[PDB]
Every structure is written in structure tokens, then in C-alpha cells.
Amino acid sequence: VLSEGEWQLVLHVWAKVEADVAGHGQDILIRLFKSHPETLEKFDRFKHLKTEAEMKASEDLKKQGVTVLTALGAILKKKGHHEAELKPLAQSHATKHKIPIKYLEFISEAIIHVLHSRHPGNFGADAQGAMNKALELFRKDIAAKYKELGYQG
Ligand code: HEM
Ligand SMILES: O=N[O-]
Ligand SMILES: O=N[O-]
Ligand SMILES: O=N[O-]
Ligand SMILES: O=N[O-]
Ligand SMILES: O=N[O-]
Ligand SMILES: O=N[O-]
Ligand SMILES: O=N[O-]
Numbered sequence: 001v002l003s004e005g006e007w008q009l010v011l012h013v014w015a016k017v018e019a020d021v022a023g024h025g026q027d028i029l030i031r032l033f034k035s036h037p038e039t040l041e042k043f044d045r046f047k048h049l050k051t052e053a054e055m056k057a058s059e060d061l062k063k064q065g066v067t068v069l070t071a072l073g074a075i076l077k078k079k080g081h082h083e084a085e086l087k088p089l090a091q092s093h094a095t096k097h098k099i100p101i102k103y104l105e106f107i108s109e110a111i112i113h114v115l116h117s118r119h120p121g122n123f124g125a126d127a128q129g130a131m132n133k134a135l136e137l138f139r140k141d142i143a144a145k146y147k148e149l150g151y152q153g
């Protein structure tokens with residue numbers, strides 16, 4: 001359970017993300033695909049992309065980035081009261097996309113990396129700790145739902 005102070009650190013850095021959600025989504029997905037290339041194989045629309053330059057030029061990848069971060073933003077803004085938002089997401093990622101929890105850990109690492117790089121004004125150690133707690137809570141609750149849904153993850 002996060003404190004209100006922890007939520008405020010999370011939402012203060014998120015507010016900077018929201019100044020340019022598409023840019024941040026590109027940087028995050030590219031970092032994920034560079035760091036864990038196996039994750040790219042999950043995305044049929046753009047799994048053929050071979051290089052970071054190609055990834056930056058992909059309008060499809062950019063749209064996906066916006067989709068992911070907007071969904072996560074909505075969840076963060078709930079400050080842990082995110083049961084309704086998590087249901088469809090867990091279902092799709094468990095049953096349609098087959099995303100293991102391990103890959104949610106990878107994207108969480110990618111998020112933290114990009115925020116640390118872009119937002120050192122709002123992403124010092126305390127803020128990073130808060131965001132890690134928020135993302136750990138997200139993963140824990142998604143993992144619980146995966147098990148309910150029948151997916152080992
Ligand atoms: C912060 C974590 C994540 C959030 C909030 C998120 C959110 C979403 C959303 C909202 C969609 C569109 C609606 C849906 O299908 O549920 C989507 C689609 C998808 N997600 Fe995620 N996602 C996350 C992590 C991941 C990860 C780590 C992977 C793969 C390694 C993944 C793979 C996909 C795929 C394959 C699709 C379908 C894309 C397409 O239409 O071609 N997601 N995700
Ligand atoms: O009050 N911040 O844990
Ligand atoms: O693209 N991140 O090293
Ligand atoms: O971009 N992962 O949905
Ligand atoms: O707490 N949401 O499953
Ligand atoms: O969206 N991750 O289950
Ligand atoms: O609900 N899964 O696309
Ligand atoms: O970013 N949470 O997988």
C-alpha cells in the first residue's frame with residue numbers, strides 16, 4: 001500500500017510524461033525491445049522491425065506507446081483503486097496476448113529507465129522508489145488476476 005506522499009511523487013512525474021505521451025511511449029517501447037528483444041515477438045503489427053531507427057519511424061509503434069501509457073496513467077491516477085481498469089487488461093494480456101509477468105517486469109524496468117533519463121528533476125531516489133512501489137502493486141494485482149483467469153504468467 002502506497003502512502004499519499006508516494007502517490008504524489010508518482011503523479012508529479014506522471015504529469016511530465018503527459019506533456020508528451022507519444023514521445024515517452026516510443027522511448028519506453030524501444031528501450032524494452034532493445035533490452036529484451038524477445039518481447040518484440042509479441043507484437044504482430046511491428047515485430048518485423050529491425051533497428052531503433054525503424055522503431056522511431058513506425059506510426060504503429062507510436063500509437064501502441066500512447067495506448068500503453070494512457071492505460072497505465074489511468075491506473076496510476078486511481079491510486080490503487082484500479083480493480084475495474086485491471087480486469088480487461090489482465091484478461092487480454094493473459095488470454096489474447098499471452099504476456100508473462102516476467103515481461104511486465106521488463107516494461108516496468110524500461111519505464112523506470114526512461115523516467116530516470118528524461119526527468120531527473122522529478123525522478124530522484126524517493127520518486128523512483130514510489131514509482132517502483134506503484135508498478136510492483138500493478139504487477140502484484142495483475143498476477144493475482146492472471147491466476148484467477150487460469151494463466152500461469
Ligand atoms: C504497463 C504494462 C502494460 C499496459 C498498461 C498495457 C496496455 C495495453 C493496452 C491498453 C492494450 C490495448 C487493449 C488490450 O488489448 O488490452 C494493449 C495491447 C497489447 N499489449 Fe499491452 N500493456 C502493457 C504491457 C504489455 C507488455 C509488456 C507486452 C509485451 C511484451 C504487451 C503486449 C501487448 C500486445 C501484443 C497488445 C496487442 C497489440 C496490437 O494490437 O497489435 N503489453 N496493451
Ligand atoms: O509519507 N510518505 O511515505
Ligand atoms: O533505448 N534505450 O536504451
Ligand atoms: O505496449 N504494450 O501494450
Ligand atoms: O486490484 N485489482 O485487481
Ligand atoms: O497489462 N498487463 O497485464
Ligand atoms: O479480452 N481480450 O482481447
Ligand atoms: O509496468 N508494469 O508492468
Ligand SMILES: O=N[O-]
Nearest residue numbers: 031035109110113
Ligand atoms: O530497460 N531497463 O533498464
Ligand SMILES: O=N[O-]
Nearest residue numbers: 076080134137138
Ligand atoms: O499502480 N498500481 O498500483
Ligand SMILES: O=N[O-]
Nearest residue numbers: 139140141143144
Ligand atoms: O497477490 N499476489 O499477486
